[PDB]
Structure formats: structure tokens, C-alpha cells
Ligand binder design. Structure first.
Ligand code: ATP
Ligand code: MG
Lengths: 997, 301
DNA sequence: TGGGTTTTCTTTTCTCTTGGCGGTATGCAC
RNA sequence: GAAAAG
DNA sequence: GTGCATACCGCCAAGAGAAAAGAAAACCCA
């Protein structure tokens, strides 16, 4: 790779290209001419950048000067140099003989005229100019015609992507003009880059102190606005002086946005800084990320890409709009590509050091520019000026942590002048329009903001380049499934919102999930103060997140909104808006319902009734006929819980999922009071969930008859649970341990239930330490009120044992597959590699767990913060993490593939399908069809030899070493040592009622 | 945690542990008496001795042979570093509470400002003089664990490394830190004994040393209260976080008050470094801030 | 062989590494 | 330091 | 050719922020 300062200079010249500051770039290129120490740092890419810049202006003298610079250091000109020359000669309307001479020289040196139009990444304006320049000399030369788009022909994705089939793709309930207007609304939101929402906290009455503090804060913010502006222009002139002499100043990066936008962003991050201040490097990363994400939107605004996106989008909406018909039905990505696709090349992220210095410069200039009067008690009093922010440190063991903490007077000014509004970033808010179809790992989700295909903690990431090395048709199913998940219109259940806002604004109800305010918090002495601070801080954080979620729910109350979906590195699908989505708590799931509704038909209402029982937590171990009989027994309780939620018999609070049960009670109450219940149009999603879907996939891989009986892959009249049986065995050992000299047996009594061992028995097939089981079986015991708090540790270690004692001689094939996966991960990580595998749908998955992280240091004024490179710069895979991660990551890849196949085959049948991870949601009318499709896709996924295909792929990928195979023959034989499949037959899963229930 | 078999000059340390010959109500809380040779050396003094052995293998013999002592030993199974539970469910034989130990002894000291209630002799392990040294100071300002009832002497063995660093002043500026400031004003720590570390057997090195940990009445003040101590510590660690800076820079990092005004209240003038601070200087820097009652915003802890 | 280090995986909200000195290498004015 | 989802 | 300013790297002390409570055993550096 290049040097660090080489990256600084390359980013400098690229940002001078994007700020249209060519004399500055030419001057700094001239200053590094005349020395050898830093012209050695100058590489061909920087000269090509200045080459292209002077090309786009039509300048020929500087063009020839840069050519002489390239030939002066012995550097050979590249394809981009001749493309830039042809661009400048096309723009200048050069004489045809000289362009002829240029093309003869270009063909003489060894260039490929055909490859320059394709291999060189360049805009369509550059393409048109170079095409005109060539065609003035060679008018018979032409580019190859566009091929028809490829069609994926894998066996699992053969029924989809087959044109000889009867399809009924579902269509949105909104017409073409409405969706165009929603597109314009979301475009304006993403151009504005921020959303202001009204807080759902009850308003404080106007007072003299409130408005006085309001005016004081407004005057202070205007003073800071002018101070930030003055400091920004003084820094701008200092950095321009530092560019005239040859130095990397960060001047074009500060010229990437207008001054008002940078001052506005700095005022925003000043506003959104808590009383306990955030880490300094967190502010640096946040400011760099916000500057980059606003530069992206500004660049598409200036370049004309927004208008092209509009022109493509109003044509794309004819596929989804109800009133508009396409001539040939097709998938959204296929209609995006069959329509003339707008050009969207990836924009490269900034170099991470330069990101850090931009963030640090903005943070330092915010710290220095803002000053407040120290004595706010008397405005007429003369007061010295103190900084609004301070650099405190916090020490954790060896660690020294820099924190920017606000002034306590500024904080007291913030809570005294309570702000009625709240501000969100536009990517943290649900989309008002259907998202862009995922046509590549670079285009999709939000309209103008870049969204990653795979979620990652680190900035530099191995997953995206692996997503790009694969064949183009490999990711087609995953992209179409993510598009289908994002193409689900959501709306807010306003009644549940009314009840939760009723309880939030008053004294909260902590048992239902509505947080209580710290005004109701409790208020040897130091022990009481410490407990008061701890409880108050926990309640305050909980109510803060509830305030954010409820404010977003109130904002989207009358709007149809879409949640674009993203992946993790293992393939599971997460909606991009973080606060308000259907993967959240019971309250958030109760708020959300489908916007398009389906008539219930002949079997809808029954499923709704079953769903209600499924949300009570009662009759979990009963057949569906017993669940429906129970729902018919408690119908009056359902009607009273719907009609009188907080003023009646309050049955729904006793449910395991109370707000969801209340919403389903309202849906059932509306449906049974309809004149024709088949004609009732229902918008409430109905959920089908797998009983230990990890065990389901494990038994499907191993073909274990006992496991496929135990988790419902074998047909049965009753549902089967592993948790109840194991908990019964633990109660047998607890009764055996009773009436002896052990106190924990009589302490436990009836606290051994499904819930306390649920997490452990769920986990154990993913290798769990005996120490982690203590923490795993103590929070569930700590939340119990009848449990004594003294014996939490004793009962925790009592439930660590007698569970693994109960789980011995159980799940033999599952444990064998676990052991083989664990040893394969251990030996792959032990040979200095990361574990990599391909899903049956073709998605490549790699594990980013490396120890000994590479660290670098920034020299600065306020402090020196350490930043970590993780984009393959670390060269040691972390064996413990790979071992502990592979047996769950493979199963998560498998059930993500199952969900994607179920989604793609339900889409062809006109079904609205969404999914929480292993919980498939659809309309109550379509549940059986979904069930049917689910079962076939399970049988279609597991008819394929996933273990054997994984083994031979692992042999091809990780066993091809020229010399390392001598020591790697042991891992070669362990990859060829899948345990044999048992005697379970998969088409019985087609007849399994309680597979998903 | 070392089991010492050497009897070398045990009488001299026993007599300096004894103090006044007339009074044997002073008790010796001997920690880790494995072989019991040091136990017999402490019994040669004639005062009552209580053992706090924690290892289960050496504890059954420790209850035995106490009849020959005619009641000079009350064996309690615990360890001196844990005492008051921090994240604790029930009582286990390795760790008990201060109330249980003090009710077994029966000794309770209502006033802190009176004469010393009790004496503790002990050791620190090969790794962990810093952790338990931090722990005793945490117990010592806010009255917790062994210091919870009274002003108990903790006369004990330390490494020589600490006795260089903990008794450091701005003289010898290379080794100087926060435990130095806390302990040198907290206790009057003098010279007792200087035995070699490798001379003592364990069931090329820094030499062992012995210190007197005796708290001072000057500790708790109208401005330095036992409840404000965590405000105090965040000065000392932050001021030594970057130690080549003036105290004005660290006060502007830690306090919204005019630092130069605080320095013209204490006396040092505007160039003066955190390394050139005596331990009492940090205490005075803490308490000059407090009496400005009009300025309510005093700290950024 | 003896001793320091972590405790199944993913995701989200709340809000947890820096500093000082000294030595070595390199580039520039007289 | 806490909470939630799978 | 020589001395001084600048930038980069090593390296131990960080005060190994108190948990030195804890049933539990395997992994990597010494
Ligand atoms: N803690 C966890 N560790 C690993 N995988 C987990 C964990 N929690 C959930 N999963 C994964 O999510 C799925 C289980 O989710 P869920 O909470 O519904 O449990 P379950 O045992 O399937 O539930 P139920 O029996 O109540 O229907 C499996 O695919 C499993 O691999
Ligand atoms: Mg489930």
C-alpha cells in the first residue's frame, strides 16, 4: 500500500477535483516539484487526478505540463491519462488531424480502445466526450450492444426466475401519483438531512423563568453562530496560506460544504450532547461521518443525479402502483434494470486518518469557539467567559479516556428551558416512499444516502469486497428478498399509541413496559445516595429511549411508511430505522400493523383466534383445536380487554405479551362483530414461529429421528417442547435434592419453569461455558419478586448443574454436527484464516474476528486519540471467537436462507411476508399458504446436501495449499468427516402441523 | 500470601507491636498464620492474638492446640482483604463481614477521634500491592470494612518499590503518583523493619519492608468530608494524568472557576506544576474551592 | 510445566485509551 | 452501568 | 561537513477505578 501522507495527498487532489479548486492542486503539485523526498510520494494516481481535472476544464497548457511531469519522473502514462486527453480534445473542439494523431499514439503505445470505455470507471459525461473524440476520427467504431440481463439458474432459485410460470405478484394499495408525491416528500427529507418531531412528553406551562431561559439560550446560540463563523473563516484563511506553501491543510475538505452547513452541523452536535459528555473520539467520528454523508447528498444534488433518480423512479412506480400495469410482470430489480437504469458509481470513503483529523479539527474549533458567561444568576453582572465544553478524563483500570463534558450551567439551562422538539437524522427515520430496489451491494434502501449491504461495527470491512468478487447472479435471491422485505407498507396502530401515550404522559406503568419518570423515583447515607443515583439514571435512560420511540411513532401516525432492510454478515435481515421497527419490544410490535389488508376468507378468523392464544402464553403445549376452543372460551374476556382496556377486568395485562395481545384482542373484536367475517379486511400480522429453529435445522442436517420427533419435524397431534421436558427433569432432581441438607432445593420451590431454563436449553447446542450459564440463569431469577435475593448466586450455580446433567445422552447427531463445526472453525482459524462459507442461495459469509488490533496515533492540540485499523490490517484470526461463533453463524445462515426462500416463493403467490428472525409474519388469510410454502422450502433447502456441499466447498476454498497441506491434512480429513445422516425422512415435514405454530 | 517460617528478630518486632507493657487489650489480627511460628512469636508477647487464616488446609490444626494457650486465640475463618460484600449473595467461609468479625470479637468503637481501637498486622501478595493498597484507602476515607467502626492500625509488610513511590515527594520526581498523595497525608508512615523478601520462605528481587498504617485526625475536615472523597480523587488522578502541565490547565479541565484566582488563594503563582506538589498541597487545592459558596458549580466529576 | 485471560452468537437503545520522555533517523541553513 | 429482540 | 529543528518509534513505569468473593475449566505466553 501507499504511505499515509500519500493517502493524504491523494484525498487532497480528489477533494480539489470535487471542490473545483484546480489552481490550488496545480500549485501544490508544483511545490512538490523541485524535491525528491515528497515527489517520491507522488504516484501516478495523483497525476491522473490532476490530469482529469485539467481535462474537464478544457485546459491544454496545464495538461501538457502534467504530461511533462509524468515523463520527467520516468512514470508511464495510464489509460486515464489518454482518456483525459481525449476528453480535453473533445471539449476544445480540436482539429480532427490532431485527435487522429492522439488516437494513433494511443493505439501505438499498447492501449485497448474497447477496454477504456468499460474498465475505466468514469461518468457518462466523460464517456460521451471521449466517444465524440473517437468518432470524429473513427466514425465506424462503436461500443458492443447491451446484452439482455442474466437470469439465475441455481436449483434452489430455479422456480423463481422461470418465465414459464403462472405468477400473481401483489401490488400496493396506493396509486401512481400518491407514490410519486411520497417519493418527493422523502427526497425533500433526505435533502434536508434532519427531521424535527414534537416530543410526546406533556408540555410544561409557560412561565417567566422558562421563556427567560429560552431567550438566554437563543441569544447565546446566535453568539456561538457568529463565533463559529469567524473561527471557520480564520481557519480557512490559515489553511489557504498553508496550501500556498506546500502542505496538506484540510482546506478542500472544509470547502466541501458551505460554511452555514458546517456551523449548523456543529450547533446540532452541541445541542445533542448529554449532561454526561460523550467521548472525544466519538465526536470526531460523528462529525466526520456527518460531513461525508452531507457531502454525498450535496454531490448528487449538484451533479444532476437527483433528477435522473426522479425520472427513473416515476417510471419504476408503474410496477408497484395498483392502477398502472407493466406489459410483462417482473421483479422490482428486474423492472429497475429493464428500464433504463441510471448511472450510480460507488463513492469511495475518505481515508481514515483524514476522517479523524477532520473530526478533531471540527471538535477543537467547536470547543474553542463556544464561550458562555460563567455567572448566569445575574445578567447585569459582569462575568468572565468560560468554555461551554471541557476536556475531562475518566480512568478505567489502566485506561485513560477523554470526554467532552458540558458546563453544568449550560445543562441546567437545557432542562430549565425544556425544548418541545427532537431531532433525528434522516436515515434513522422510516422512509415515506418505497425504498430503492437492491440492485447491487451499493445501491438500495434510502434514496440518496449510501447504505451498506452488510452491517458491520468497523469502518473498513471485508464483507463488501467479498460481496463484489462473487458472480453477479449469486446475490440475486438475497437482493430480491431484501427488496420484498423493504416493500412492505407499514402503518401505526393508533389505538395502542393512544393508550401508551396515556400511560407515558402520566405516571408510567413499569410492568407493561411504559417507563416511569424519575419524578417518581426514590429520593449508610452514602449508600442511600448511591442507590438513588443508580435507580434514577436507569429510569432516566429507559424513559429517554421510550420518548424517542414514542415520538417517532407519533410522527408516523397518519403516514404509510416503509422500513428498508439490511443484512448482518451472517445473512439475517434487520430494518435500517433503529428506534421504531417490528423487531423491537412488545409495545413497538403492538404499534405496527400492515397498511394493505386482505379479506379473512373461510379460515382467517380461526388463525386470528389462535394468534391471540399464542400471545397469551397460555395453552402453549396444546393442539390447535384446543387453542381455538380456549379462544372461544375466553371470548368475553377478549371483548372486554378490547372495549375497556384500562377501565375493565384487565385480562390482557396478564398475558406474556400484553400490548400485542391487546392489539390482537381489538382485531378479533372487530372481526367477530363484522356482518360477514370472511369479508372483514384485516391488517394485523399473524406470526408463525419455530420451536427451537436451531434444533430444527440441526435435526434437518443430521436427519435425526429422535430430534425431529422432539422438535416438530415429525407429524404429531400435540406440540413438542424440549424446554418443558428438560425443566421437568430439573424438577425431578430438585425434588430429589429436597428434604436433605441443601437449602437451595426448598428455596427454589416452583421457580423452576420453562423461562429460567429456556435460554440455556436453547443455547446449549451452541457451545456454552458453564460460567456463562450462571449469568444466563440469574437475570431471569433476579427479575422474580417472590425469589429471595440472597440465594441468587446459589440458585444460579444450582441451575448451571442438573441441566447439563439432564442434557447428557441427548441430541447425539446435533452434538456431533456441533463438534465437527467447532473443530473445523478451530483448525481454519489455527492455520491463520477466517472461516468463510457460501449459503445455498449463494451469499458469501465471512467472520470478522481478529485479535491484536492495529493501532495508530494522531498528534493534536487538545489530546491524542488512538484509532484502530481493522480492514484486514490485523493478521491474526481470533481462534476462540471463531470457535464460539461458527456453530451459531452457520445455523443463522441456514434460517436466513429458509426465510429468503419462503419470502421469494410467497411473493409469487401474492402474499405479504415479513419476518422477525424465525418468526414469519403474514396476513391471517394467507397463513396456511405461507405454512405450506415454508414446509416445501424447508424440504427444498434440506434435500440439498448442505453438510456435503459445505465440505466440498471448504475443501476447494481452504485446501489448495502448495506447501501447507502437509500439516493441513488433519484439517483436510476433519472437513471430510461429516457424521452420517440418520433415518428421518423430510416430506413428513410437509405434514407437520406444529413445525411453525 | 506467603507463609513465613523465619523466627529472625521476631522478639523485636513483637515488642514494637506490643507498645505499652501494661496493656494487653490491644489485639493482633495476624493474617495468614500457616506454619504458626509467627503465631508462637506473637504469643511470646503475652497479649491476645486473633488469626484470620483463609486457606482450608491449614485451618483445622489452627483450632487445635488452643487449649494449651488457655484462651489466647479465637480462630475465625475469613480473609482480611474482602470483608464487606460488594457483589455478594450469602456468607461463605472464605469471606465474612466486618459486623460478624467485630461481633465475634465484641469490640466496638463509637468515637473515631478517640484512642486507637485495634491493630492489624498483615502482608500484601507478590502481585497486588496496588489493588489492595487502593482498597484500604477506599475503606479509609469513607469508613468501610476494617476502618468502619474505628481508627484501626494496619501495620503491615509492603514492597520496597511502593516505599519509594508512596513516600515520594516532588523530590525524586520520576516515581510519584496518586496513592503517594492519598497515603502520605492519610497515615503517618514511618520506619519499622527492613527484612529481605527472599529470606522468607514460600510454600533477584525487591527487598521486603514494613510500614505503619495509622490514620490521622487531620484527615476529615469541614471541606474534605468522608462523602466527598471521590470528588477529591478525580483531581489527583487527572492532575497526574498529564503531569507536565501547570495546575491552571488541569483546573480549567476540572473546574469552571478562575484557576489563577484559586492559585492566588493558595499561594503558588501561575507557572507551578502538578509534579512540584506536596501531598498537603492537593488537599489545600481541594479545600480552597469549597468555601466559595456563591459559585455553586464547583467540579466536573 | 506454571501462570495470566475469557466464559455461545447476532442486532438495537441508553453513552468506557492517553501521555510523557528519550533515542534514532532525516532534512535543511551556514 | 442498564434495558430490549432473536 | 556540521549543528539544529522536525517527525517517528519504543517503552516501560499509567495509580493493573476497589471488587483480592465466589463452585471451573480450557487456551496462549513465559
Ligand atoms: N442466545 C442465542 N444464541 C444463539 N442463537 C440464538 C440465541 N437466541 C436465539 N437464537 C437463534 O434464534 C432462533 C431461536 O429464537 P427463539 O427466541 O424464537 O427461540 P426458540 O427456541 O425457537 O423458541 P420457541 O421454542 O419459544 O418457539 C434460533 O434460530 C437460534 O439459533
Ligand atoms: Mg421460536
Amino acid at each position: 500500500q501507499l504511505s499515509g501522507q500519500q493517502q493524504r495527498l491523494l484525498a487532497f487532489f480528489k477533494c480539489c477535483l470535487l471542490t473545483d479548486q484546480l489552481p490550488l492542486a496545480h500549485h501544490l503539485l508544483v511545490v512538490h516539484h523541485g524535491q525528491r523526498q515528497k515527489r517520491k510520494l507522488l504516484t501516478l494516481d495523483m497525476y491522473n487526478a490532476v490530469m482529469l481535472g485539467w481535462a474537464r476544464q478544457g485546459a491544454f497548457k496545464e495538461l501538457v505540463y502534467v504530461l511533462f511531469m509524468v515523463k520527467d519522473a520516468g512514470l508511464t502514462p495510464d489509460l486515464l491519462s489518454y482518456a483525459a486527453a481525449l476528453q480535453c480534445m473533445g471539449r476544445q473542439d480540436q482539429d480532427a488531424g490532431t485527435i487522429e494523431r492522439c488516437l494513433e499514439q494511443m493505439s501505438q503505445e499498447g492501449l485497448k480502445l474497447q477496454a477504456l470505455f468499460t474498465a475505466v470507471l468514469l461518468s457518462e459525461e466523460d464517456r460521451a466526450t471521449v466517444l465524440k473524440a473517437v468518432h470524429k476520427v473513427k466514425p465506424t467504431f462503436s461500443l458492443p450492444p447491451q446484452l439482455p440481463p442474466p437470469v439465475n439458474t441455481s436449483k434452489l432459485l430455479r422456480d423463481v426466475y422461470a418465465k414459464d410460470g403462472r405468477v400473481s405478484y401483489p401490488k400496493l394499495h396506493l396509486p401512481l401519483k400518491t407514490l410519486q408525491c411520497l417519493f418527493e416528500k422523502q427526497l425533500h427529507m433526505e435533502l434536508a438531512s434532519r427531521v424535527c418531531v414534537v416530543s410526546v412528553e406533556k408540555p410544561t406551562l409557560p412561565s417567566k423563568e422558562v421563556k427567560h431561559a429560552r431567550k438566554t439560550l437563543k441569544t447565546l446560540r446566535d453568539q456561538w453562530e457568529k463565533a463559529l463563523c469567524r473561527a471557520l473563516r480564520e481557519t480557512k484563511n490559515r489553511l489557504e496560506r498553508e496550501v500556498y506553501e506546500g502542505r496538506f491543510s484540510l482546506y478542500p475538505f472544509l470547502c466541501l460544504l458551505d460554511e452555514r452547513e458546517v456551523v449548523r452541523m456543529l450547533l446540532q452536535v452541541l445541542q445533542a450532547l448529554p449532561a454526561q459528555g460523550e467521548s472525544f473520539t466519538t465526536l470526531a467520528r460523528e462529525l466526520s461521518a456527518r460531513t461525508f454523508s452531507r457531502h454525498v447528498v450535496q454531490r448528487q444534488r449538484v451533479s444532476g443525479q437527483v433528477q435522473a433518480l426522479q425520472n427513473h423512479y416515476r417510471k419504476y412506480l408503474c410496477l408497484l402502483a395498483s392502477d398502472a400495469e407493466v406489459p410483462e410482470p417482473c421483479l422490482p430489480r428486474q423492472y429497475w434494470e429493464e428500464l433504463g437504469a441510471p448511472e450510480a458509481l460507488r463513492e469511495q470513503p475518505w481515508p481514515l486518518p483524514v476522517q479523524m483529523e477532520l473530526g478533531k479539527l471540527l471538535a477543537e474549533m467547536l470547543v474553542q469557539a463556544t464561550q458562555m458567561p460563567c455567572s448566569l444568576d445575574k445578567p447585569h453582572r459582569s462575568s468572565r467567559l468560560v468554555p461551554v465544553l471541557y476536556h475531562v478524563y475518566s480512568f478505567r483500570n489502566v485506561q485513560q479516556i477523554g470526554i467532552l463534558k458540558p458546563h453544568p450551567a449550560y445543562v441546567q439551562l437545557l432542562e430549565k428551558a425544556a425544548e418541545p422538539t427532537l431531532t433525528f437524522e434522516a436515515v434513522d427515520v422510516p422512509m415515506l416512499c418505497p425504498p430503492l430496489p437492491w440492485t447491487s451491494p451499493h445501491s438500495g434502501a434510502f434514496l440518496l444516502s449510501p447504505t451498506k449491504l452488510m452491517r458491520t461495527v468497523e469502518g473498513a470491512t471485508q464483507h463488501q469486497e467479498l460481496l463484489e468478487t462473487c458472480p453477479p447472479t449469486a446475490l440475486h435471491g438475497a437482493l430480491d428478498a431484501l427488496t420484498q422485505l423493504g416493500n412492505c407498507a407499514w402503518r401505526v396502530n393508533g389505538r395502542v399509541l393512544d393508550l401508551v401515550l396515556q400511560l407515558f404522559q402520566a405516571k408510567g406503568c413499569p410492568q407493561l413496559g411504559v417507563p416511569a419518570p424519575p419524578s417518581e423515583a426514590p429520593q449508610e447515607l452514602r449508600r442511600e445516595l448511591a442507590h438513588c443515583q443508580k435507580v434514577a439514571r436507569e429510569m432516566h435512560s429507559l424513559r429517554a429511549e421510550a420518548l424517542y420511540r414514542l415520538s417517532l411513532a407519533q410522527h408516523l401516525r397518519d403516514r404509510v411508511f416503509w422500513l428498508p432492510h439490511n443484512m448482518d454478515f451472517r445473512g439475517r435481515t434487520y430494518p435500517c430505522p433503529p428506534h421504531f421497527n417490528h423487531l423491537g419490544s412488545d409495545v413497538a410490535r403492538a404499534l405496527l400493523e400492515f397498511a394493505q389488508g386482505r379479506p379473512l376468507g373461510p379460515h382467517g378468523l380461526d388463525w386470528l383466534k389462535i394468534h391471540l392464544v399464542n400471545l397469551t402464553g397460555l395453552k402453549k403445549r396444546e393442539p390447535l383445536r384446543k387453542r381455538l376452543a380456549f379462544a372461544e372460551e375466553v371470548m368475553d374476556d377478549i371483548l372486554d380487554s378490547a372495549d375497556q382496556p384500562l377501565t375493565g377486568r384487565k385480562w390482557w395485562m396478564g398475558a406474556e405479551e400484553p400490548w400485542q395481545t391487546l392489539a390482537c384482542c381489538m382485531e378479533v373484536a372487530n372481526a367477530v362483530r363484522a356482518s360477514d367475517p370472511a369479508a372483514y379486511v384485516s391488517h394485523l400480522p399473524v406470526h408463525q414461529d419455530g420451536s427451537c429453529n436451531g434444533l430444527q435445522h440441526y435435526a434437518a442436517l443430521g436427519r435425526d429421528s429422535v430430534g425431529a420427533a422432539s422438535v416438530n419435524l415429525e407429524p404429531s397431534d400435540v406440540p413438542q417442547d424440549v424446554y418443558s421436558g428438560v425443566a421437568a427433569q430439573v424438577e425431578v432432581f430438585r425434588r430429589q435434592d429436597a428434604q436433605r441438607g441443601m437449602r437451595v432445593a426448598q428455596v427454589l420451590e416452583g421457580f423452576i419453569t420453562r423461562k429460567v431454563v429456556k435460554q440455556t436449553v436453547m443455547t446449549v447446542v451452541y457451545g456454552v461455558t458453564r460460567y456463562g450459564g450462571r449469568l444466563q440463569i440469574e437475570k431471569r431469577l433476579r427479575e422474580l419478586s417472590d425469589f429471595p435475593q440472597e440465594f441468587v448466586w446459589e440458585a444460579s450455580h444450582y441451575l448451571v448443574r442438573q441441566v447439563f446433567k439432564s442434557l447428557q445422552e441427548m441430541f447425539s447427531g446435533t452434538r456431533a454436527i456441533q463438534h465437527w463445526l467447532t473443530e473445523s472453525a478451530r483448525l481454519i482459524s489455527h492455520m491463520g484464516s477466517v472461516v468463510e462459507w457460501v449459503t445455498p442461495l449463494g451469499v458469501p459469509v465471512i467472520q470478522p474476528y481478529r485479535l491484536d488490533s492495529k493501532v495508530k496515533q494522531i498528534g493534536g492540540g487538545i489530546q491524542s486519540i488512538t484509532y484502530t485499523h481493522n480492514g484486514d490490517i490485523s493478521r491474526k484470526p481470533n481462534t476462540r471467537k471463531q470457535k464460539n461463533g461458527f456453530p451459531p453463524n452457520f445455523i443463522h445462515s441456514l434460517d436466513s436462507s429458509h426465510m429468503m426462500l419462503t419470502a421469494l416463493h410467497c411473493y409469487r403467490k401474492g402474499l405479504t411476508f415479513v419476518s422477525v428472525h424465525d418468526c414469519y409474519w403474514t396476513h391471517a388469510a394467507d397463513v396456511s399458504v405461507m405454512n405450506q410454502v415454508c414446509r416445501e422450502q424447508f424440504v427444498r433447502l434440506h434435500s440439498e446436501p448442505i453438510l456435503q456441499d459445505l465440505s466440498r466447498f471448504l475443501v476447494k476454498r481452504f485446501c489448495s495449499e502448495p506447501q501447507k497441506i502437509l500439516e493441513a491434512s488433519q484439517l483436510k480429513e476433519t472437513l471430510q468427516a461429516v457424521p452420517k445422516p440418520g433415518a428421518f425422512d423430510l416430506e413428513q415435514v410437509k405434514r407437520s402441523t406444529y413445525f411453525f405454530s | 500470601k506467603r507463609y513465613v517460617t523465619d523466627r529472625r528478630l521476631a522478639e523485636t518486632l513483637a515488642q514494637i507491636y506490643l507498645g505499652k507493657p501494661s496493656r494487653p487489650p490491644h489485639l493482633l489480627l495476624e493474617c495468614n498464620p500457616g506454619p504458626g511460628i509467627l503465631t508462637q512469636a506473637l504469643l511470646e508477647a503475652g497479649a491476645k492474638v486473633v488469626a484470620l487464616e483463609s486457606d482450608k488446609t491449614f485451618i483445622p490444626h489452627l483450632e487445635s492446640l488452643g487449649k494449651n494457650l488457655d484462651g489466647k486465640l479465637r480462630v475465625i475463618h475469613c480473609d482480611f482483604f474482602k470483608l464487606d460484600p460488594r457483589s455478594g449473595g450469602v456468607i461463605k467461609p472464605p469471606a465474612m463481614s466486618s459486623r460478624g468479625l467485630f461481633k465475634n470479637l465484641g469490640i466496638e468503637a463509637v468515637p473515631w477521634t478517640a484512642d486507637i481501637p485495634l491493630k492489624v498486622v498483615g502482608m500484601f501478595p507478590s502481585r497486588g500491592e496496588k489493588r489492595a493498597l487502593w482498597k484500604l484507602a477506599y475503606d479509609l476515607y469513607s469508613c468501610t470494612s476494617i476502618y468502619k467502626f474505628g481508627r484501626i492500625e494496619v501495620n503491615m509488610f509492603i514492597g520496597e518499590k511502593e516505599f519509594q513511590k508512596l513516600m515520594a515527594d516532588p523530590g525524586n520526581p520520576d516515581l510519584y503518583h496518586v496513592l503517594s498523595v492519598i497515603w502520605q497525608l492519610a497515615c503517618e508512615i514511618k520506619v519499622l523493619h527492613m527484612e529481605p523478601w527472599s529470606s522468607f520462605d514460600i510454600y533477584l528481587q525487591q527487598k521486603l519492608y514494613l510500614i505503619q498504617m495509622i490514620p490521622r485526625q487531620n484527615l476529615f475536615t469541614k471541606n474534605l468530608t468522608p462523602m466527598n472523597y471521590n470528588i477529591f480523587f478525580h483531581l489527583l488522578k487527572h492532575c497526574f494524568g498529564r503531569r507536565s502541565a501547570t495546575v491552571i490547565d488541569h483546573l480549567r479541565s476540572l473546574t469552571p472557576l478562575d484557576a489563577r484566582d484559586i492559585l492566588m488563594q493558595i499561594g503558588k503563582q501561575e507557572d507551578e506544576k502538578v509534579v512540584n506538589m506536596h501531598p498537603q498541597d492537593f488537599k489545600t487545592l481541594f479545600e480552597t474551592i469549597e468555601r466559595s459558596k456563591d459559585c455553586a458549580y464547583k467540579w466536573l466529576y
